[PDB]
Ligand binder design. Structure first.
Ligand SMILES: *[C@@H]1O[C@H](CO[C@H]2O[C@@H](C)[C@@H](O)[C@@H](O)[C@@H]2O)[C@@H](O)[C@H](O)[C@H]1NC(C)=O
Length: 372
């Protein structure tokens, strides 16, 4: 299945229209991962445009964060331009002042453009935070956070490195072979999400193909997959050695390891960061109609609760848009409530979060203005 991407554009702080900042384009909900993105100054691609390693969500769709530093002027258009097969012309979204899990996850994506070429990325998260990555060239574990070692010995991991290195190297080789037997259509990608967690059961490992639950761990085919999975599971159910290997790795090794990542994290896990919030007038929807927007940002951990107010009286029109990430492993949420200019004054916006601890940030309105 193919899924047209969802460009979302937002800054990290507000513009005072003068002071240096980051811009975020965040692209998600898209398959296949062969994408091109760019950021724009008035028509112009920039350069020191950083982005995170690729990844994918519980529905196999992919997602990314593209960002750069820069300062704003009262002139100066900004926008996020994205091209991707399912699109019929680069859908460029414009920026605006006025807007517009205690489990160790190892995720892999191996893409297969043709017999000649292939490529794979792989990652190693813990809950929301990516703990590890893979060096494809040098064939080795990029550790990422410092405590990403856990209490696994220097030598302990040195081995796993290899046990993956073979794995990764085998995987491409084998599939490329199997390809025709099982009528895998080039180009195609195969995703995998394996790991530890809980506390009943413990293990897991799912393996989509063209963005679709295809195969899972004995080995079971997915109904939707059809005969292909059905077949592909046979070949695999028969290799007991393989079953057993993983059974040991994900069974009791990786959870021992999880235990490890968990206890070694703490100081950065039990970590709290105060938000920051401000105020818009997103586009007036129709006649004498306002649309004040909230802008909580820069907070961690994720769970945040946010309401447009008016004293203690919760305003139930508050719409709560998605939680994007900023680059500094923090969050950003934009809550929005729209009502007639007369209903407008007196409105607050209240931001509950663990980092404040009892003292919810309250943010009132004098348009297009904002305290405290
Ligand atoms: C096999 O595909 C190869 C990879 O093509 C990729 O290159 C990217 C930069 C992108 O633009 C897409 O074209 C692909 O994801 C390529 O090196 C070979 O020419 C292809 N071989 C044949 C025989 O068609």
């Amino acid at each position: 299945i193919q899924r047209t991407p969802k460009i979302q554009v937002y800054s990290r702080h507000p513009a005072e229209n003068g002071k240096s900042n980051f811009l975020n384009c965040y692209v998600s909900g898209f398959h296949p991962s062969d994408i091109e993105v760019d950021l724009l100054k008035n028509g112009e691609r920039i350069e020191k445009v950083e982005h995170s390693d690729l990844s994918f969500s519980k529905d196999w769709s992919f997602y990314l964060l593209y960002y750069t530093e820069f300062t704003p002027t009262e002139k100066d258009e900004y926008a996020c331009r994205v091209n991707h097969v399912t699109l019929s012309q680069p859908k460029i979204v414009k920026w605006d002042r006025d807007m517009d899990q205690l489990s160790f996850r190892m995720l892999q994506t191996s893409s297969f453009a043709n017999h000649s070429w292939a490529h794979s990325e792989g990652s190693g998260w813990l809950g929301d935070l990516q703990t590890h990555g893979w060096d494809t060239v040098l064939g080795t574990i990029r550790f990422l956070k410092p405590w990403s070692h856990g209490n696994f010995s220097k030598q302990e991991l040195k081995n796993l490195q290899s046990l993956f290195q073979l794995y990764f190297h085998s995987f491409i080789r084998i599939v490329q072979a199997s390809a025709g037997q099982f009528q895998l259509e080039y180009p195609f990608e195969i995703q995998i999400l394996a790991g530890c967690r809980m506390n009943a059961p413990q293990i897991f490992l799912n393996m989509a193909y063209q963005g679709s639950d295809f195969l899972s761990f004995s080995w079971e085919p997915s109904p939707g997959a059809g005969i292909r999975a059905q077949n592909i599971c046979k070949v695999l159910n028969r290799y007991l050695d393989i079953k057993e290997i993983l059974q040991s790795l994900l069974g009791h090794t990786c959870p021992r390891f999880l235990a490890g990542l968990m206890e070694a994290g703490e100081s950065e896990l039990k970590r709290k960061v105060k938000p920051e919030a401000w105020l818009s007038c997103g586009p007036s929807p129709g006649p004498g109609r306002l649309q004040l927007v909230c802008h909580v940002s820069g907070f961690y951990p994720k769970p945040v609760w946010v309401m447009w107010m008016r004293g203690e009286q919760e305003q139930r029109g508050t719409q709560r848009g998605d939680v994007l990430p900023n680059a500094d492993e923090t969050w950003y949420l934009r809550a929005t409530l729209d009502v007639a200019a007369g209903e407008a004054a007196g409105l607050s916006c209240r931001v509950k979060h663990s980092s404040l601890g009892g003292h919810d940030l309250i943010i009132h309105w004098g348009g297009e203005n904002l305290y405290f």
